[PDB]
Amino acid sequence: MLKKKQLTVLDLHPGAGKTRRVLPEIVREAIKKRLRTVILAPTRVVAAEMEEALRGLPVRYMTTAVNVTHSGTEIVDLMCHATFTSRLLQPIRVPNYNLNIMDEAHFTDPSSIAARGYISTRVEMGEAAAIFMTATPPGTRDAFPDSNSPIMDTEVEVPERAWSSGFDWVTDHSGKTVWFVPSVRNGNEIAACLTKAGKRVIQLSRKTFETEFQKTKNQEWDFVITTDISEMGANFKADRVIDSRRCLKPVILDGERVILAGPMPVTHASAAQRRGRIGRNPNKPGDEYMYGGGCAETDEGHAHWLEARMLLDNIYLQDGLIASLYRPEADKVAAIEGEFKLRTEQRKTFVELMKRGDLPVWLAYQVASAGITYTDRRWCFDGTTNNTIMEDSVPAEVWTKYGEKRVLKPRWMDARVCSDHAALKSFKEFAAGKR
């Protein structure tokens, strides 16, 4: 696998030991061959688990999720998918790694798709080797792959709102359940319903992931309500998965706004990853998987693939050349390589709106391409009346950095800035000039 000009897909089933058994062997071989190597983790939680599996080996952890004193003689670097793409975008010189290892290579966030495109392009050029580790490679149509022990798969109607009757099987269970919901807001209603009935519930989402995941290991719980983020290597000591089989899909309409469409069916890769949380212990057969709908290829036309093209168009590779998306996921977006290429000053604004501003990629691109500087927030208030952001069914208001109270009405509307209370609170601080 470690020979140049080769990309290998390590597609072992969930729980087969890709992270704890295969990864340390590959690292030992890479160090013996003096291959300058990068290990890419999807989240800070997986980075911590990788440190346990690689304990003792000389690895330089480029993450604050690991508290290790680096000796300075490491030729292997470990960092998150987003950090790799972020350093590629920034003026910082990233080493031209001989070997690129991506764990949970199925991750569909824009920076993971961009990282796969960059790496696969370097392999196609004959400059590097790569290993993509996932049970569900791009293009998988199998939602029920192999497991360490047999799983009872049951198609059932799954609640997406609070209920007063009709779902006795949900609460008549003495084990621990992991329940995947389409959104944070949907999760809140189900958690409140379960809490009212006496269940101990923990909720997980992209922003709260590191802090709340720790509660799954330090206390007893009956339910974990989570969004699709728990598909990326999160492990639980549970005996049942409840899966709505639904997700939200960011969609760009007429090239001028982003809406959160659905809930709609998840892909086969997502369903297999959600099911994959259980059936992991060969000594405990009969873990249950209750699913509430079918699968469909809802990644076609999903805004994340367009956003990955915006990132890749602004990453230097060689002179004018631009990295393509990883071939099995390249038809998910209709886009011309280089169409989002920005000039030096606008590119720097694009990077800062993402790194410091925390804006979605599509929204950061609209602002930077319009020639607006990072600190200029006039655009947050001069959009049309239909772009008015609502809070508690009434227009959201902020005090501008000038001291004036104005209705939040962005020139470009991206639904992700107000998808929940936490997102809208952060966007109000941005519009106010607080970061």
Of 187, 158, 329, 207, which Cα lies nearest the Cα of 248? 187
Do 245 and 271 form a contact (C-beta atoms < 8 A)?
A: yes
d(CA 48, CA 381): 42
User: Which single residue is written with the structure tokens 């998918």?
Assistant: 81
424 is written with which tokens? Answer: 């809208």
SS3 label, residue 177? strand
Query: Percent helix, strand, coil in the chain (nearest 5)?
Result: 35, 20, 45
Of 132, 130, 129, which Cα lies nearest the Cα of 103? 132
The structural architecture, per CATH, of the domain 6-133 is 3-Layer(aba) Sandwich (3.40)
Specify the CATH class of 151-291 in words: alpha beta
CB neighbour class for 157 (10 Å; exposed up to 12, middle 13-18, buried from 19): exposed
d(CA 415, CA 285): 42
Of 341, 279, 286, 287, which Cα lies nearest the Cα of 316? 341
SS3 label, residue 167? coil
In terms of DSSP bridges, do strands 7-10 and 287-291 run parallel, antiparallel, or are they unpaired?
unpaired
Helices and strands in the chain, H and E counts:
13, 19
Residue 306, beta-bridge partner list: none
Is 19 annotated in a binding site? The answer is yes
**Identical fold, 6-133 and 151-291:** yes
Do 347 and 337 form a contact (C-beta atoms < 8 A)?
A: no
333 is written with which tokens? Answer: 């977006």
DSSP string, 328-362: GGGGGS---TTTTPPPHHHHHHHHHHHHTT---HH
| Sign of the C-alpha dihedral computed for residues 64, 65, 69 and 73 taken in this order | negative
CA–chain centroid gap for 300, Å, is: 17
Element spanning 10, H or E = strand 7-10
> For residues 432, 425, 248 and 261, what is the CA-based torsion angle, rounded to 10 degrees?
-50
DSSP string, 226-279: E-GGGGSS-----SEEEE--EEEEEEEETTTEEEEEEEEEPPHHHHHHHHTTSS
- Backbone phi, psi, residue 226, to 5°: -140, 155
Element spanning 62, H or E = none
CB neighbour class for 117 (10 Å; exposed up to 12, middle 13-18, buried from 19): buried
DSSP string, 136-154: S-TT---SS---SS-EEEE
Our CA angle for 358, 306, 249, nearest 5°, is: 75
Is 279 annotated in a binding site? The answer is no
d(CA 322, CA 261): 30
* Count of C-beta atoms within a 10 Å radius of residue 309: 28
CB neighbour class for 297 (10 Å; exposed up to 12, middle 13-18, buried from 19): middle
In terms of DSSP bridges, do strands 240-243 and 177-180 run parallel, antiparallel, or are they unpaired?
parallel
**CB neighbour burial string for 403-415, b if at least 16 within 10 angstroms, e if fewer:** eeebebbbbbbbb
Do 248 and 204 form a contact (C-beta atoms < 8 A)?
A: no
CB neighbour class for 317 (10 Å; exposed up to 12, middle 13-18, buried from 19): middle
Is 17 annotated in a binding site? The answer is yes
SS3 label, residue 364? helix
CB neighbour class for 434 (10 Å; exposed up to 12, middle 13-18, buried from 19): exposed
d(CA 333, CA 326): 12
Sheet holding 246-253, edge to edge: 246-253, 257-265, 413-414
Q: Give CA separation, 12 vs 3, 148, 181, 269, 412, in Å.
A: 21, 11, 26, 13, 43
For this experimental structure, what is the resolution in angstroms?
1.8
Element spanning 76, H or E = strand 76-80
Deposited experimental method: X-ray
User: Which single residue is written with the structure tokens 């199925």?
Assistant: 106
d(CA 306, CA 339): 11
Is 56 annotated in a binding site? The answer is no
CB neighbour class for 395 (10 Å; exposed up to 12, middle 13-18, buried from 19): middle
Do 38 and 21 form a contact (C-beta atoms < 8 A)?
A: no
Do 119 and 57 form a contact (C-beta atoms < 8 A)?
A: no
Is 14 annotated in a binding site? The answer is yes
Is 249 annotated in a binding site? The answer is no
Residue 38, beta-bridge partner list: 77, 100
User: Which residues precede gaps in the chain, with C-N > 2.5 A?
Assistant: none
Residue 21 DSSP one-character state: I
Residue 378 DSSP one-character state: G
- Backbone phi, psi, residue 427, to 5°: -65, -35
Is 105 annotated in a binding site? The answer is no
Is 81 annotated in a binding site? The answer is no
383 is written with which tokens? Answer: 């959009």
Do 59 and 21 form a contact (C-beta atoms < 8 A)?
A: no
31 is written with which tokens? Answer: 């160090």
SS3 label, residue 384? coil
